[PDB]
Paper text:
Here we report seven high-resolution cryo-EM structures of filamentous peptide nanotubes based on a cross-α supramolecular architecture that provide insight into the designability of helical peptide filaments. A structural interaction is identified based on an appropriately placed pair of arginine residues (RxxxR) within the corresponding peptide sequences. This local interaction motif, designated as an arginine clasp, is robust within the context of these cross-α assemblies and can guide the coalescence of helical protofilaments into structurally defined cross-α nanotubes. In contrast to most structurally characterized filaments based on synthetic α-helical coiled-coils, the chain axes of the helical protomers are oriented in a plane nearly perpendicular to the long axis of the assembly.
In a control experiment, a second computational optimization was performed in which positions 6, 7, 10, and 36 were constrained to those in the original peptide sequence. The arginine residues at positions 6 and 10 defined the RxxxR motif, while residues at positions 7 and 36 (Ala and Gln, respectively) appeared to be important for organizing this motif. A comparison between the two sequences, 36-31-3_LL and 36-31-3_RR, could provide additional insight into importance of structural preservation of the arginine clasp interaction. The computationally designed peptides, 36-31-3_LL and 36-31-3_RR, displayed an α-helical conformation and formed high aspect-ratio filaments of similar width to those of 36-31-3. In contrast, 36-31-3_RR filaments persisted over weeks in solution. The differences in stability between the two computationally designed filaments suggested that the cohesive interactions were much weaker in the absence of the arginine clasp interaction. In order to confirm that the arginine clasp was conserved, filaments of 36-31-3_RR were analyzed by cryo-EM. A 4.5-Å resolution reconstruction of the 36-31-3_RR filaments displayed a nearly identical structure to that of the original 36-31-3 filaments, with very slight differences in the rise (2.49 versus 2.51 Å/subunit) and the rotation (124.5 versus 124.0 degrees/subunit) for the respective 1-start helices of the 3D models. Accordingly, repeating the statistical analysis of this assembly’s RxxxR motif produced very similar results as for the original 36-31-3 filament, indicating the native rarity of the geometry.
Numbering used by the authors:
A (entry chain U), B (entry chain O), C (entry chain I), D (entry chain C), E (entry chain D), F (entry chain J), ...: 1 to 36
Amino acid sequence: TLEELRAEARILEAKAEILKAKAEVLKAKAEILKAQ
Amino acid sequence: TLEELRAEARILEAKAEILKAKAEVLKAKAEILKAQ
Amino acid sequence: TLEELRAEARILEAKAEILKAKAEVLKAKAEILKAQ
Amino acid sequence: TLEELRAEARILEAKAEILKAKAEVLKAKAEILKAQ
Amino acid sequence: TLEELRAEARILEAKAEILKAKAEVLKAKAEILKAQ
Amino acid sequence: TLEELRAEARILEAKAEILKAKAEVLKAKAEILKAQ
Amino acid sequence: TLEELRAEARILEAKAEILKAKAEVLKAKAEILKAQ
Amino acid sequence: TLEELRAEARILEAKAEILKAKAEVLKAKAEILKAQ
Amino acid sequence: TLEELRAEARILEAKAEILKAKAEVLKAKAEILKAQ
Amino acid sequence: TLEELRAEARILEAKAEILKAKAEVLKAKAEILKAQ
Amino acid sequence: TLEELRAEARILEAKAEILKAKAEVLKAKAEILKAQ
Amino acid sequence: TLEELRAEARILEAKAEILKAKAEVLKAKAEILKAQ
Amino acid sequence: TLEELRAEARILEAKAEILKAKAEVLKAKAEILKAQ
Amino acid sequence: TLEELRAEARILEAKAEILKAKAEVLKAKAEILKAQ
Amino acid sequence: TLEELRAEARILEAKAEILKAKAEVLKAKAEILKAQ
Amino acid sequence: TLEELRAEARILEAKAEILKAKAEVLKAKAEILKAQ
Amino acid sequence: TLEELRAEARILEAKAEILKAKAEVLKAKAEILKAQ
Amino acid sequence: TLEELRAEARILEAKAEILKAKAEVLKAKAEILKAQ
Amino acid sequence: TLEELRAEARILEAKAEILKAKAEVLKAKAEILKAQ
Amino acid sequence: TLEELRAEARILEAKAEILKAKAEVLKAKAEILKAQ
Amino acid sequence: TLEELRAEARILEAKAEILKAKAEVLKAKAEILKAQ
Amino acid sequence: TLEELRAEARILEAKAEILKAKAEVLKAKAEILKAQ
Amino acid sequence: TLEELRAEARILEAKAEILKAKAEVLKAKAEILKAQ
Amino acid sequence: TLEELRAEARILEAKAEILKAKAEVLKAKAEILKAQ
Amino acid sequence: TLEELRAEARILEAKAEILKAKAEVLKAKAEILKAQ
Amino acid sequence: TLEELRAEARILEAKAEILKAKAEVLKAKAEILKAQ
Amino acid sequence: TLEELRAEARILEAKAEILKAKAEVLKAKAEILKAQ
Amino acid sequence: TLEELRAEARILEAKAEILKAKAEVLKAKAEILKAQ
Amino acid sequence: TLEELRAEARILEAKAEILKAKAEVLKAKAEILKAQ
Amino acid sequence: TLEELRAEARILEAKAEILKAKAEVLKAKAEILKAQ
Amino acid sequence: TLEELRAEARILEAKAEILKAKAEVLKAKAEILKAQ
Amino acid sequence: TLEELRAEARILEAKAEILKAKAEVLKAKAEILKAQ
Amino acid sequence: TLEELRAEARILEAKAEILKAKAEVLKAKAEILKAQ
Amino acid sequence: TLEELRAEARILEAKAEILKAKAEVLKAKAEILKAQ
Amino acid sequence: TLEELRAEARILEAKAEILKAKAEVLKAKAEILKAQ
Amino acid sequence: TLEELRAEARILEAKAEILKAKAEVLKAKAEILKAQ
Amino acid sequence: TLEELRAEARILEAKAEILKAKAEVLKAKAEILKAQ
Amino acid sequence: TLEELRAEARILEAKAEILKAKAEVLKAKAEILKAQ
Amino acid sequence: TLEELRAEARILEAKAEILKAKAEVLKAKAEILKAQ
Amino acid sequence: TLEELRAEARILEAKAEILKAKAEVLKAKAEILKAQ
Amino acid sequence: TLEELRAEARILEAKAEILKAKAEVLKAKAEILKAQ
């Protein structure tokens, strides 16, 4: 269970990181919208 | 129990971080809505 | 009991943080509702 | 008793913080209700 | 007795803070009831 | 006696503050009863 | 005696303040009884 | 004697204030008895 | 003597004020006795 | 003598005021005796 | 002499006022004797 | 399951990195739009 | 599946790197636009 | 499929490198534009 | 009986006050009849 | 009966206040009739 | 019935307040008629 | 009915406030008429 | 009906606020008329 | 209708704010007229 | 209509802000007139 | 119209900012006038 | 028009920044006038 | 016109930066005047 | 004109940088004046 | 003119760098003055 | 003139570098003064 | 003059390098002073 | 004529008030003549 | 004429107020003459 | 003439206020003469 | 003349304020003379 | 003369403020004399 | 004279501030005298 | 004289600040005396 | 004298800072006395 | 004297810093006393 | 004396730094006490 | 003495660094206690 | 003694470094505990 | 002793390095645990 919960931590750690780079697409998306 | 509660802390630590990047999707979502 | 109460502190520390990021979902939720 | 009362302080310190983030859920809950 | 009364102060300091956040639950509770 | 009376002041200072936040629970309790 | 009477003033100063917040519990107690 | 009488003034100044808040407990005590 | 009589004035000024708040305890004491 | 008589006026001014609040204790004393 | 007689007026002005509040002690003294 | 979840972590780790360099295309895209 | 998912990781690792050097073309593209 | 995906990795690895040296043409292109 | 007679006083106290404001309707009723 | 008579006092207290503001409509009604 | 009569008090309390501000419209209405 | 009458109180509370600011328009209306 | 009356409260709350700032235009309007 | 009335609240909320800053133009307008 | 009224809110939000900085020009305008 | 009103918001957002820095010229203008 | 208004935003964004550094010349101008 | 206005932005961006470093000469100019 | 204005930007970019290092001479000039 | 202004940029770029290393002589000059 | 100014740049480039190594003599000069 | 200034650059390039190795004598001089 | 007669009332209202404060100068004029 | 007579009222309103404070100088003038 | 008479009102408004604070100097002047 | 009389108002406004704080020196001057 | 009278206002504005803080020295001077 | 009077203002501005912090020494001086 | 008076301002500015931190020693001095 | 008074400012600037950190020793000194 | 007073400043600057880190020992000393 | 006082500064500079890292031992000491 | 005090500085400099790495053992010690 | 104290520095320098790498064993020890 | 302490330094220098490579075994140990 211990390493399993360590693994269940490990999969949920990854799911945040996709949403992090999802925001950074939207971050420079506005940077196009202001540099013009 | 001790390392188990340490693990039950560890899984609940991860569940916050998905909601953190969930907000940051919505953060730059408005930044598109103002840079236009 | 001491480290146990330290652990019972430690689990209750985590339960606040989910509610913190729960509010920040609702924080930028209104920010969509004003940037439009 | 001293560190025990220090620990009994420490558990009661945590119980306030859940109620703090409980209010902040309700804080941005009205912020949805005004940004619309 | 001195540090003991300092500790008996310290436990009674914590008991106020739960009631403080207890009110702030009720504070934003009415804020839902007016933002609608 | 001096620091002892200073400590006996210090414990009695705390006992007021619980009653202060006890009233503020009842303060916003009526605020629910009028915002509806 | 001087600082002692200053301290005997200081303890009796605290005893009023508990009764002050004791009244303010009863103050908003009637405010529930009229907001309904 | 001068600062002593100033101190004997200072202790007797405090004894009035407990009776002041003693009346204000009784003040809002009737306010419960009329708001019902 | 001058500042001494000024101080003997100052202590006798305080002794009236305890009797003032002594009456105001009795003032709202009858106010309980009529609001019922 | 002038400021001295001004001071002898000043101490005798205070002695009236204790008797003033002495009457007002007796004033509301009858007010208890009629509100019942 | 002029300001002196003004001061001798000023001390004799105070001596009336003690007798004024002396009567008002006796004024409410009968008011106890009739409210019963 | 453990190495499998380690592998399911490993594929989801890669999917973030494409979106990271996707933003950096848009990052220097605005840098053309300001250096002119 | 394991080495297959390792391979499906391996192809998706390459697709990021083309976009990385795609940005660096645009990086020095603005550097021409400022060195003049 | 495995060595095929290894080969499909291998062709896509090459396509990045042309764009890498494409940028380095533009890198020293500005270096002419500043050394003059 | 005592608090009951205090209550029977309390209801009869209210019945006067309706007649008081009943007269004050008629008071300004003539004030219309003279300001014209 | 006691709190009931307290409530029957409480409803009859309200009925006076409508008649109070009823007069004050008529109060400024004549004030229009004299300021012209 | 008790809280109901408390509520029937509470609705009749509101009906006075509209008439209060109704008079204050007429109050400053004459104040226009005299400041000219 | 209770919360309904609480709501019927709540709508009638609002209708006074428009008339309050209606008077304050007329309040400063005369203040123009006197500052000239 | 409840949230509807809460909404009918909510629209009537807004209509007062325009009249509030309508008065404050007239408030500083006289302040021009006196600072000259 | 509910979100529509929430929107009809939302447009009427904005119309007050223009009048607020309209007054503050007139506020510092007199401040020029007194600093000279 | 909803996002349209959200947009009609959004344009009227901007019109206040020009008047805000219009006042702050006049704010420091008097600050020149007093620092001399 | 939507992005157009978003653009009409966007131009009116800029017009405030010139007036903001217009005030800050006048802000340090008085700071010269006091540092001397 | 859209990118044109985006450009008309972009030129007006620059005009604020000259005035920003114009103030900061005046900011340290007083800092010379106080460090002496 | 678009890239031209982008260029007219680009020249006006540079003119601020000379004034920025102009202030920072004056910034450390006072720092000599206080370190002595 | 475009690359010319880009060049006229480019010469004015250089003139700021001499003044930047001009300040940093004065920056460490005071640092000698405080390390002694 | 273009490459000439590029050259006039290029000579003025060099003149800053002598002043940069001029400061760094003074930078370690104080470092002798503090390491002793 | 062009290559001449390129040469006049080239001689002034060298004069900075002597001062750079002049500082680095003083840099390790303090390093003797602290390693002892 | 051109190759002459190139030569006058070339002699001044050498004079820095003696001072560079002059510092490196002092560099390892402290390294003796710390390895002991 | 109506507002004119209202204005002719308004000027004649002011002429009384100067004579009112004219008497109050003479009122305290005798109060000097008796306090001496 | 109307606003002119309103202004001729307005100047004559001010002339009374100087005489009002003229009397109050004489009011406390006798209060010095009796407190001595 | 109108704003001139408004200004002639404005200067005569100021002349009263000096005499107002002139009396208040004399007001507390006697308060020194009685507190002694 | 208008702004001149506005300025002659402005200097005479200041002369009152020195006398205001002149009285408040004398105000707390007696407060020393009674607190002793 | 105008800015001169503005300056003669400005010096006389400062002379009041020294007397203001002169009183506040005497204000807390009595506060020492009563807290003992 | 103008900047001189500005300077004579500037020195007299400083003399108040020493007296301000002079009072605040005496402010917390009594705070020692009551916290004991 | 001008920079001299600026310097005489500058030395007198420093003398206040020692007294400011002198009070703050006494500020937390009582905070020890109450936390016990 | 000028740099000397600048130096006499500079030594008196340092003497405040020791007293600042002297208070902060006493600041956390009470923080030990409350965290127990 | 100048560099000497600069040195006497420099030694007194160091004496504050020991007391600064003396407080920070006591700062985290309480942090042990609350984390338990 | 100068370099000697510079050295006496230099030894006292070191004595603070041991106490700095002494606190940081205690800093992470509590961090063990909360991470469990 | 000078180099001796420089050496006595040098030994005391080393004693801090052992305590620095002593804390960093305890720093990652808690990092084990949270990563589990 | 000098080189001896330099040597006693040199041995104590080594004892820190073992504890540094002792922590870094524990540093990556937790990194195993999170990468799983 | 000197070379002996140099040797006792030299053996203790080696004991750190085994622990350094001991950590680096554990460093890449987790790198296996993440590359899968």
